[PDB]
Amino acid sequence: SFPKYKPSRLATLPATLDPAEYDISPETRKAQAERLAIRSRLKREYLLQYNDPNRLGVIEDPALIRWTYARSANIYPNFRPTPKTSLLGALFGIGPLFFWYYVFKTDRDKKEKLIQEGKLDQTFNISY
Amino acid sequence: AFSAPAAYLTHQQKVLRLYKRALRHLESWCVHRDKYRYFACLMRARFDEHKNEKDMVKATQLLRQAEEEFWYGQHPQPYIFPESPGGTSYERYECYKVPEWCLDDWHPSEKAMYPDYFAKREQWKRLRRESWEREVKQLQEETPPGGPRTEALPPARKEGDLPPLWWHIVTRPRERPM
Amino acid sequence: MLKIIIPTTMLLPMTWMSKHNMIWINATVHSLLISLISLSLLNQLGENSLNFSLTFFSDSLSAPLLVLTTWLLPLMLMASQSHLSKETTTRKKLYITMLILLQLFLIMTFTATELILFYILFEATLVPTLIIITRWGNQTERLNAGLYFLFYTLAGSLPLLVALVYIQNTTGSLNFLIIHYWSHPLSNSWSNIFMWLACIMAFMVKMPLYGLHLWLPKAHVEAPIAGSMVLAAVLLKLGGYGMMRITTILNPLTNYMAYPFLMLSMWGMIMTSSICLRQTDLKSLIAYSSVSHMALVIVAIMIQTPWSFMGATALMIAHGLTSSMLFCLANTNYERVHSRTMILARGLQTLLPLMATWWLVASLTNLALPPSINLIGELFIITASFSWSNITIILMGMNMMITALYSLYMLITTQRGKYTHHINNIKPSFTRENALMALHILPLLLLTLNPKMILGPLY
Amino acid sequence: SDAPPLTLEAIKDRVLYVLKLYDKIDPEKLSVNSHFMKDLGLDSLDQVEIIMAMEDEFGFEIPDIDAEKLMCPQEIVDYIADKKDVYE
Amino acid sequence: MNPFASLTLTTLTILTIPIMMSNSNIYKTNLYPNYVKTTVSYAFTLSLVPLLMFMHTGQEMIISNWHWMTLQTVELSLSFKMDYFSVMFIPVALFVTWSIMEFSMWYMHSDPFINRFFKYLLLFLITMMILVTANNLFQLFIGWEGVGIMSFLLIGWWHGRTDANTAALQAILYNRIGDIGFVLSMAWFLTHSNAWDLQQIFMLNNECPNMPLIGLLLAAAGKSAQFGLHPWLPSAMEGPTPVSALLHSSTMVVAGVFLLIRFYPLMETNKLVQTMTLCLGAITTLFTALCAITQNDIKKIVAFSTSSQLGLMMVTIGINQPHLAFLHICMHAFFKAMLFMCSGSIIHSLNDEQDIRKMGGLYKAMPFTTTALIIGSLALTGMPYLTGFYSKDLIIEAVNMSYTNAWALLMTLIATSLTAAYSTRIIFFAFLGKPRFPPLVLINENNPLLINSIKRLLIGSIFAGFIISNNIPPMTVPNTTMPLYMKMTALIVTIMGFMLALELNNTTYYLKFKYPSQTYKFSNMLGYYPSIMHRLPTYHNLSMSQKSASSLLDLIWLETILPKTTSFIQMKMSIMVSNQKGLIKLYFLSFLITIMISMTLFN
Amino acid sequence: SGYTPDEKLRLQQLRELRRRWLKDQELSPREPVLPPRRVTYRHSIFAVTHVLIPVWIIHYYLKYHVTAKPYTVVERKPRIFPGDTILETGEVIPLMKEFPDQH
Numbered sequence A: 001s002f003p004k005y006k007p008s009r010l011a012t013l014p015a016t017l018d019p020a021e022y023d024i025s026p027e028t029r030k031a032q033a034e035r036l037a038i039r040s041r042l043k044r045e046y047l048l049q050y051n052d053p054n055r056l057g058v059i060e061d062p063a064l065i066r067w068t069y070a071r072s073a074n075i076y077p078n079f080r081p082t083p084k085t086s087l088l089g090a091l092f093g094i095g096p097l098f099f100w101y102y103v104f105k106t107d108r109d110k111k112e113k114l115i116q117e118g119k120l121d122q123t124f125n126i127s128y
Numbered sequence B: 001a002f003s004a005p006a007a008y009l010t011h012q013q014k015v016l017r018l019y020k021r022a023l024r025h026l027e028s029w030c031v032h033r034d035k036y037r038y039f040a041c042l043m044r045a046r047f048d049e050h051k052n053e054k055d056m057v058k059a060t061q062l063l064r065q066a067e068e069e070f071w072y073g074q075h076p077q078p079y080i081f082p083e084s085p086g087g088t089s090y091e092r093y094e095c096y097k098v099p100e101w102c103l104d105d106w107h108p109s110e111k112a113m114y115p116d117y118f119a120k121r122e123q124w125k126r127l128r129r130e131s132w133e134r135e136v137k138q139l140q141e142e143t144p145p146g147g148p149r150t151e152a153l154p155p156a157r158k159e160g161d162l163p164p165l166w167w168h169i170v171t172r173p174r175e176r177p178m
Numbered sequence C: 001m002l003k004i005i006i007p008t009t010m011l012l013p014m015t016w017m018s019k020h021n022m023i024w025i026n027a028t029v030h031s032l033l034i035s036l037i038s039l040s041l042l043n044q045l046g047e048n049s050l051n052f053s054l055t056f057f058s059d060s061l062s063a064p065l066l067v068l069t070t071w072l073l074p075l076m077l078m079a080s081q082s083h084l085s086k087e088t089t090t091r092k093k094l095y096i097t098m099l100i101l102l103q104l105f106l107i108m109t110f111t112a113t114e115l116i117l118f119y120i121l122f123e124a125t126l127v128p129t130l131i132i133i134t135r136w137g138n139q140t141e142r143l144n145a146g147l148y149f150l151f152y153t154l155a156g157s158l159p160l161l162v163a164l165v166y167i168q169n170t171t172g173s174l175n176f177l178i179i180h181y182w183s184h185p186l187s188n189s190w191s192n193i194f195m196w197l198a199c200i201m202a203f204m205v206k207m208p209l210y211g212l213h214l215w216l217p218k219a220h221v222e223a224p225i226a227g228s229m230v231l232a233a234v235l236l237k238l239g240g241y242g243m244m245r246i247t248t249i250l251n252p253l254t255n256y257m258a259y260p261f262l263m264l265s266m267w268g269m270i271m272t273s274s275i276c277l278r279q280t281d282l283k284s285l286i287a288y289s290s291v292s293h294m295a296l297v298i299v300a301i302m303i304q305t306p307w308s309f310m311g312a313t314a315l316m317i318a319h320g321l322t323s324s325m326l327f328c329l330a331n332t333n334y335e336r337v338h339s340r341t342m343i344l345a346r347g348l349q350t351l352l353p354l355m356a357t358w359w360l361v362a363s364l365t366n367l368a369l370p371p372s373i374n375l376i377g378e379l380f381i382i383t384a385s386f387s388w389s390n391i392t393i394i395l396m397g398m399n400m401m402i403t404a405l406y407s408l409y410m411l412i413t414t415q416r417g418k419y420t421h422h423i424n425n426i427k428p429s430f431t432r433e434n435a436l437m438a439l440h441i442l443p444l445l446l447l448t449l450n451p452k453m454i455l456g457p458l459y
Numbered sequence D: 001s002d003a004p005p006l007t008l009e010a011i012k013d014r015v016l017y018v019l020k021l022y023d024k025i026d027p028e029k030l031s032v033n034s035h036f037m038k039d040l041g042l043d044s045l046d047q048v049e050i051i052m053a054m055e056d057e058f059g060f061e062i063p064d065i066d067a068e069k070l071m072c073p074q075e076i077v078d079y080i081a082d083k084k085d086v087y088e
Numbered sequence E: 001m002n003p004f005a006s007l008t009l010t011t012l013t014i015l016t017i018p019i020m021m022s023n024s025n026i027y028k029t030n031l032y033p034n035y036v037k038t039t040v041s042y043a044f045t046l047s048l049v050p051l052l053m054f055m056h057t058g059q060e061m062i063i064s065n066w067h068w069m070t071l072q073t074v075e076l077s078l079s080f081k082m083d084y085f086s087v088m089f090i091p092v093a094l095f096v097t098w099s100i101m102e103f104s105m106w107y108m109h110s111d112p113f114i115n116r117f118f119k120y121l122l123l124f125l126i127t128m129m130i131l132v133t134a135n136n137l138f139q140l141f142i143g144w145e146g147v148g149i150m151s152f153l154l155i156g157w158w159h160g161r162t163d164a165n166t167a168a169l170q171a172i173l174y175n176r177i178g179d180i181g182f183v184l185s186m187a188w189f190l191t192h193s194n195a196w197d198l199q200q201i202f203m204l205n206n207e208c209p210n211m212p213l214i215g216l217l218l219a220a221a222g223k224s225a226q227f228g229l230h231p232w233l234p235s236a237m238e239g240p241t242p243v244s245a246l247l248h249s250s251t252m253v254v255a256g257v258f259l260l261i262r263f264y265p266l267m268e269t270n271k272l273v274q275t276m277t278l279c280l281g282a283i284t285t286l287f288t289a290l291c292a293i294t295q296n297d298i299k300k301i302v303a304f305s306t307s308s309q310l311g312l313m314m315v316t317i318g319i320n321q322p323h324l325a326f327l328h329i330c331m332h333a334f335f336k337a338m339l340f341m342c343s344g345s346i347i348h349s350l351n352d353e354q355d356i357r358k359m360g361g362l363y364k365a366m367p368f369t370t371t372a373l374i375i376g377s378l379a380l381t382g383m384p385y386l387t388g389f390y391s392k393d394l395i396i397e398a399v400n401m402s403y404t405n406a407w408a409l410l411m412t413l414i415a416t417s418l419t420a421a422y423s424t425r426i427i428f429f430a431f432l433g434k435p436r437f438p439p440l441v442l443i444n445e446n447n448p449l450l451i452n453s454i455k456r457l458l459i460g461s462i463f464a465g466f467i468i469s470n471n472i473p474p475m476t477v478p479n480t481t482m483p484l485y486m487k488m489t490a491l492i493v494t495i496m497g498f499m500l501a502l503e504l505n506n507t508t509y510y511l512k513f514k515y516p517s518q519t520y521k522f523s524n525m526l527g528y529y530p531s532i533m534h535r536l537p538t539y540h541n542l543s544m545s546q547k548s549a550s551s552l553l554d555l556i557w558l559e560t561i562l563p564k565t566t567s568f569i570q571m572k573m574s575i576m577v578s579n580q581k582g583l584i585k586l587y588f589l590s591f592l593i594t595i596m597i598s599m600t601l602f603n
Numbered sequence F: 001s002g003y004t005p006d007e008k009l010r011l012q013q014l015r016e017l018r019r020r021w022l023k024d025q026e027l028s029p030r031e032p033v034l035p036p037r038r039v040t041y042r043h044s045i046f047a048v049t050h051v052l053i054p055v056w057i058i059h060y061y062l063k064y065h066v067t068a069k070p071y072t073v074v075e076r077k078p079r080i081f082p083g084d085t086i087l088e089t090g091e092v093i094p095l096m097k098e099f100p101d102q103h
């Protein structure tokens, strides 16, 4: 027996330590076979369009188009106002503004009070 | 790298992979050659004791505690060959690799230099132009219906035929072009 | 001032009477000549102004903006020469007409002795840009982008007209000289607060202020290259110029009125710089960088100190030049790839080394590397904000670090690594594109030798 | 660099040298085309150690998927020449 | 008239001629590296004269030749400070650069872009000279950023390698973290002292407050890679060996220590900032030596050695001994540059192999590199009457007899022991055992460029300490009388380091193997700092930047507030208004209702 | 284990084609056809155009333009020790207080 390795979000589990790979069933083998089948179909299509001497352009990638479209333009039509979204939006969009306003207002009120009281010693402070 | 991958790894391949990894990391731990030879022979002796075991369940239970033991003592800084995916010169020369089609955009004053090379290039272009038209039909007739089941390609079977999808494997830039 | 205005007007009949194959050459030559004439305006005095007539004046705040506006047109023509090759002669002439009209409106806007004339021209600039965006645009979202760009600006600027007519009814004049000499303090009143808001929001929305910047990414991404160049270089500076001109009557109300906008800009520069880190589009990244720079300019104008004003002027000029160059580089990549996606075309330094050098110089200038005027404005504004409050330094430093981060990210993603294998239509860079980048970049490094030319009237 | 341009003859000579230094396999019996499992009666573990010895000899490392189907010295030499782009 | 100024400006000016000729024909030929090397050697032999004049008399000058701009009461001009520090550092930097360039003429012979590489080295040198001789804060900032940009460009020299780009961006990130404090200091000095000039700052700051000195300390820690911002320096080894020998070993990385030296009149009037400087230096040197003790890459080991030496330099700054820190800078330049030269020669001779597990007996196979590395290791460990003696021994003596922390002194002593220890590790694992490199031997030293470049720095690392120490005027009170055990403490700890390291290394021959402990794992992964601080913060910033700043706020809520709400309300009102069936019944009923309302509500 | 016959044949044909291509990548003796057209000695010219000329311009620039303005070049005052004499004035600094010398 040896000390156990505990995975985390930023340190994933090694492939050789997965109990899933050791639980082999015919369904798992068929799933792997069809995964490699679709991968081989995609690779065949890409290489057929890649080795063609006639093509003199960019091979359009539907996966890339879908990625960019989902990241940019598909957000709002799928947006639904929920307690989670409302609370997170309110926090992340209002809290920092009021926090910084409080900080700067307190600092400037302190500075103005010191200036009015005259105890700040602003000698040589010419450029502002 | 060159060989097409399989849908899965069998038990025997996994055992070989663990054996290679353990030997490499033991060599990394044991710097000196005589010590490494001694401990590698001892590792082989410990490794082949369960060679003749027969049932699948105990075999699968083994190699697993072996992988855990390997991970516990895996030498967090193993030796890596300089050109390996983790080496100090893995992709050092990848900025010097220029594609072959870039020569098609050279100015005629530049193509005036090296005339024999460009004549040979034109001959290669003609060969590719014919071979591609042959290869498309050859691959269409040879592929199983419903799409390929593996990313392995067949060789050429006729006399004047060339292996399908050969242009971008034969015309690699180089390992160290500059 | 008419020695600049009349040739710009004569550009139109010259364009419309040109041969079918000589429009670009004539337009470029005469635009460059007009720019040379504009150089004379830079000589400025430490005294009041260059009051040419009752209608127009020039100042060391207006002179650099006028020079940049006159210089931008030949570059826009050079950039537009490419993608308009398959266009009919009449429509190309119409495009050149739109560009000339936009230049004329901007030139008359920057002199503008009287505020209603300034408003009229500041709104007249809206039509040619809208036509350019919604007519010669590639995608189908250009219509929505133009609608956003029109309606944000108009909603912001309609109360400004009411504020201006009220100010003229009360004071009696809107000439800037009389306004400056007869200025009176604003009492802390609700009516004065709303007058301040009506005077400020029109220029805030065009900066763009954070939270009111939604129109800018749409308009910049969907516009043709010339439209993006002009929008990023000159049209954003109209709000800053207007704020600098109009904050003379908003005192002492500005001391406490500025806080909501100061907080918004100070947090929004961080927000937009962080947004730039996760972006899949070059144009969107450049637009958000522009938003960050203009937010920092807003902070400078709101602080309302001499160093703030000098830094704001310098940063406006430097940002205009840098954003124009970055947009031009992105367009050069797009006309080869037709995708406008960062991750598609990679490792272009191997294929195009000189264009990679241009990319590096543009990124270094956007990164505010000394002694470029970008850092001159950045540092002056940072010092003024520190004098305003010592706690601003944290936000300024965070913004600087994130700015360097996404600038070098944009450089590395496109220029370094391994080339994309299946892309084989990347032809050598033309002399036109190289000359465009050179004419963008050389004025910056020449201006860093004479920074007093772009430091504004408070130098 | 100053690296001599190694040839096919050098690769074959070095492979056969390292193989003849392997005491398990008799020097006389082995031939460029001599198979590993059947012609010389070696185990698969012997094959992986042979691959490792090749790796240490030539200073570069072969992926496992390619190594597990290298069964003759001739195809080992062919693989090395293809990897290092050897002309003759 | 007074050739001091003319010569000092002439050196910097003639350093820039090959940059102007980079567009000429010589740049397209193979004579460009020799041209640049000759220019650097001429600049060095020219700059040797003002140092001689200062040694004779002590000449000190300020040259404000060109007036760039004036903002109100603040005047900014191109001003050069040519004090002791400048006239002493310029010859050393030029000598090291000349040696490194002659070495690069051999090392980078097969690189297609060597003219460019040479041009970049010249550009970096010019920027560093700008940094060193600057008289105001703006010029020194110009040099500060120029050296950083040259570091970014030279680290990612092989731009096809992902790790090189990652290391370059890491260096940029850490240097910007330092730039934050630099900008804070500039803003404070301009606001309060009304100047960026050094003379006015020295006059108007008799009791310097905490804020500008803390900003300066942050900038120095950022650029000198102190414990908080250390990891970028070891990662900067991705670049070519000459780059690591010139920039990240002896010239660029001492910039923060030099900045703290330049502001020493204000540093001595503050006691808290001195304490923070001392603690930072001590923790940096200890942690970096502990990281170095167990590394297998030779370049990584030597880089951690450089970081530990910088930590010792900042300890010296913390104990209020700036001139001693400058002397240590000068000595470390020589011997660390030569150590990188030897490491690069070893790497090239073994087919670009860097790991020490695959290099064995090189003491006899290649003896000139062996003797040079042995002399450099002896110099590094403060062997008596050697370049490292005249600085490191004084550092230890001054720390031992000063009113300072006990912890910092203990950490410094342990760092010295660990320094001896990893020097022993390098020698033992690189030169003593049986060979472990591939059978095809390609070992060769017989190249005049490499031999001459190494031997010049060898003569330097043997005699420069004595020469410089005996030629400069005194600048601090000496430690004349000392306890005998306190006088030998440096030698005692160093010999203890040799003995313990050698004893522990000799056990690797034994035929026993045990799994590593937790302390070894901690030391090998550099205290797990790179893993945690490169996976957690970066992920948390990027995830927020995508989810909240980009999507949640910008693409959703800001869009919902003004435009979507306006569109929805206007569309609903349009539907309500325009949904009329066209029946005059309802229309005139509404007219009747409307007529009644007007009569009764408006009068 | 091992290659399938199809894999063997494909690898053989591919490696033959690759060797043919690599051989074709070589150059003939006349391949770099260069078109010609025009329109201590090394150290001596170098020491004039790279050292003497720059120092002439800088000395002229410093001696006649930079020093034309005040305070442009400021020099640290020379140290004065007891027993020294001054070229400008000629007076001699008196010696010190004859400290008791021993060891």
Ligand SMILES: CCCCCCCCCCCCCCCCCC(=O)OC[C@H](COP(=O)([O-])OCC(O)COP(=O)([O-])OC[C@@H](COC(=O)CCCCCCCCCCCCCCCCC)OC(=O)CCCCCCCCCCCCCCCCC)OC(=O)CCCCCCCCCCCCCCCCC
Residues within 6 Å of the ligand: E293, E294, E413, E414, E417, E418, E421, E425, E493, E496, E497, E500, E501, E504, E514, E515, E516, E517, E518, E519, E520, E521, E523
């Ligand atoms: C005042 C009186 C003055 C006289 C003082 C006495 C004179 C000397 C007495 C001797 C004392 C010890 C000297 C021997 C050093 C140890 C060597 C050793 O045995 O290493 C092998 C051994 C395991 O090796 P391995 O796992 O088999 O590695 C496999 C191969 O060997 C892999 O091997 P490789 O080939 O890969 O690399 C070999 C490398 C690899 O070896 C290592 O792994 C290095 C790790 C041990 C060395 C680190 C020692 C430095 C101590 C600084 C720590 C500061 C505090 C840090 C606080 C941490 C907080 C968690 O080893 C070396 O190269 C040599 C190591 C250093 C020896 C040479 C210099 C030692 C003299 C300087 C130390 C003291 C004298 C100061 C002089 C001034 C006079 C005062 O390492 C240890 O077991 C560590 C021993 C001591 C560690 C103490 C820290 C434990 C902390 C645990 C937690 C405690 C509670 C904390 C609670 C906190 C709550 C907030």
Ligand SMILES: CCCCCCCCCCCCCCCCC[C@@H](O)O[C@H](CO[C@H](O)CCCCCCCCCCCCCCC)COP(=O)(O)OCC[N+](C)(C)C
Residues within 6 Å of the ligand: C188, C189, C190, C193, C210, C211, C212, C260, C261, E561
């Ligand atoms: C959406 C993306 C950003 C868009 C731009 C946002 C910027 C616009 C924000 C406007 C700035 C502030 C407006 C008024 C500031 C005056 C200070 C006042 O509000 O504070 C207190 C005022 O107290 C209370 O706040 C009274 C007002 C309460 C009603 C206001 C609604 C609060 C939230 C509304 C926000 C909606 C903004 C978006 C509109 C669509 C001071 O108390 P008091 O001494 O008595 O009044 C001093 C003024 N006097 C002297 C003239 C009398």
Ligand SMILES: CCCCCCCC/C=C\CCCCCCCC(=O)O[C@H](COC(=O)CCCCCCC/C=C/CCCCCCCC)COP(=O)(O)OCCN
Residues within 6 Å of the ligand: C152, C155, C156, C159, C162, C163, C166, C190, C191, C192, C194, C195, C196, C197, C198, C201, C205, C212
């Ligand atoms: C991007 C969209 C932004 C749109 C602009 C938002 C702000 C608009 C500014 C407020 C609108 C009215 C401007 C006022 C015009 C100037 C005239 C003036 O200042 O005189 C005031 C007039 O002040 C008013 O009447 C203001 C009444 C406001 C009615 C219209 C409300 C519009 C919305 C107000 C709330 C939102 C304002 C900020 C929006 C934030 C950004 C979205 C005093 O009038 P007198 O009676 O003559 O003198 C008093 C002594 N007898």
Ligand SMILES: CCCCCCCCCCCC(=O)SCCNC(=O)CCNC(=O)[C@H](O)C(C)(C)COP(=O)(O)O
Residues within 6 Å of the ligand: B011, B012, B013, B015, B016, B021, B022, B023, B025, B026, B029, B046, B047, B048, B050, B051, B052, B053, B058, B059, B060, B062, B063, B066, B067, B069, B070, B073, B074, D043, D044, D045, D046
């Ligand atoms: C320093 C690192 C730490 C070290 C820790 C590692 C621990 C490893 C110890 C585990 C030992 C085992 O093999 S675990 C036992 C798992 N089960 C079996 O081995 C059953 C059948 N064996 C095979 O099939 C093999 O492939 C074989 C016949 C050998 C070759 O065959 P070839 O004829 O196809 O070469």
